[PDB]
Amino acid sequence: GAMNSSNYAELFNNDIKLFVDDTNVYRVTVHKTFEGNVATKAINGCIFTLNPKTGHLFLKIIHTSVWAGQKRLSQLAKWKTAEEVSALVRSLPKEEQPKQIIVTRKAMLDPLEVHMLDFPNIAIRPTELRLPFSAAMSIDKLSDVVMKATEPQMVLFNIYDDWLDRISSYTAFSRLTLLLRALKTNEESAKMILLSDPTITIKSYHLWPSFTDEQWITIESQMRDLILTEYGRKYNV
């Protein structure tokens, strides 16, 4: 069944689950040709597969070579996503395989179900949550590793850094989605808030700054204010 806000805390129980977001798999720039036409050029993409309880992100880099000589790429991209997610599940030990995979876009349902036929007890579900995982490429270290790739590549991250040492998975996911929503709403301003104190650094093995508990409270308030400010600007409120 579809996931939403009534059964929201279920995301953080002990049944292993993965979110899959495909919005950055097939990425293009749009430019003008010599004849005056308009042409696309693909750039490297990624699949965003996240365990919301543990923070484990399986970032599969989609190199532009996979599109070469292929037709109907937006359709193919959904099947490619499903093929790689299935391969990921097959590569995990049984006790690490998910009980549910939640896709952020309903068009991923049939491709993933078909690729997952060998796993009949893994439920494939849409969600009614509007999740901002399309802004994953606004996280600098994720964008860097995707753009530098010269071949298909799987990169592993903990998208919560060390937060679970101090807060619950529920709270960590809420912080993640607030940060990503801010980066999706006003990327340059969200990036500014996070870099504004150069003495609070990002550890080599982290994605986000080493804020104290009180600093995170301030940062989260600044991100909420950014989102509300943009809403008012957009709707003249």
Partner: protein, 300 residues
């Protein structure tokens, strides 16, 4: 010509025989149906006047024996029975008083509708879908579920149609996931035609049987099967030419026979829009497309 003798008609009922129907009143002097033509297959069906719930009926081949109908006051339905003693049957069916209380099967000579609807339907295959080996005839009703439906609860009383499931390992070769889901030719040609049905005649026969069970009994699982078998062909880029041409004829006569007021429940809008306007074989169903657009434009 063949006769279907009725011991009596104790309860008011609408009786169908093949594509025809008439009414019998409670305790009317009714002793059955005479003058039935050439019967490779026939179906006799019932809907009680005092309780339209459960339509039910019997598929039979006059060549496989002598079939009569008798009402059972305990189970409350008209039951088909076979008589092994031919002399006795010949004697009841040739009695001119009995024959005067029988309605004549009304075959217009121009009409070929019944053999267009049932050409590929065979009793031997019906009896594998409807498993009741001690009888030469086969009971179907409005409520009987299909094996597939049961897999998603009395296996004796089930419709054992060939299971068709587009998202199953049987339909999808490992390593060909996208290919086989978008083009069902493998599933049609290798799995179904070569593997299970063996030829297109057996395929069309189950398709036609499913349609007729859906129309005559309002059997939902039969309607699902009919549409599934249509969608499997239309969603295949590679289909023998003879099979496409024959499909257009088969569907044309099914749409032509369908009651006009039954389209909101016997036709699946999604499937028919895909087959007629989006599928690989859209342009291969000219006659079906033309009758659907003029007879049932609202569905499209």
């Amino acid at each position: 010509m063949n006769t279907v003798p009725f011991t009596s008609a104790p309860i008011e009922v609408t009786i169908g025989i093949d594509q025809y129907s008439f009414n019998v009143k409670e305790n009317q002097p009714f002793h059955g149906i005479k003058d039935i033509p050439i019967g490779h297959v026939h179906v006799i069906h019932f809907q009680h006047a005092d309780n339209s719930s459960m339509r039910y009926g019997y598929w039979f081949d006059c060549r496989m024996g002598n079939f009569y109908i008798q009402y059972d006051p305990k189970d409350g339905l008209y039951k088909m029975m076979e008589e092994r003693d031919g002399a006795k049957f010949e004697n009841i069916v040739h009695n001119f008083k009995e024959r005067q209380m029988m309605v004549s099967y009304p075959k217009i000579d121009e009409d070929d509708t019944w053999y267009n609807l049932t050409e590929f339907v065979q009793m031997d295959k019906i009896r594998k879908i409807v498993r009741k080996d001690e009888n030469q005839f086969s009971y179907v009703d409005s409520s009987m579920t299909t094996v597939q439906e049961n897999e998603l609860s009395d296996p004796a009383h089930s419709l054992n149609y060939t299971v068709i499931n587009f998202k199953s390992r049987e339909a999808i070769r490992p390593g060909h996931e996208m290919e086989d889901f978008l083009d069902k030719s493998y599933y049609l040609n290798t799995v179904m035609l070569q593997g299970i049905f063996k030829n297109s005649s057996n395929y069309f026969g189950e398709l036609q049987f499913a349609f007729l069970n859906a129309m005559f009994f309002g059997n939902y699982g039969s309607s699902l099967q009919w549409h599934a078998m249509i969608e499997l062909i239309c969603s295949s880029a590679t289909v023998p030419k003879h099979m496409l041409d024959k499909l257009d004829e088969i569907l044309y006569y099914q749409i032509k026979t369908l009651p006009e007021q039954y389209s909101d429940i016997l036709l699946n809008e999604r499937v028919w829009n895909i087959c007629l306007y989006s599928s690989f074989q859209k342009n291969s169903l000219h006659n079906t497309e033309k009758i659907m657009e003029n007879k049932y434009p609202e569905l499209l």
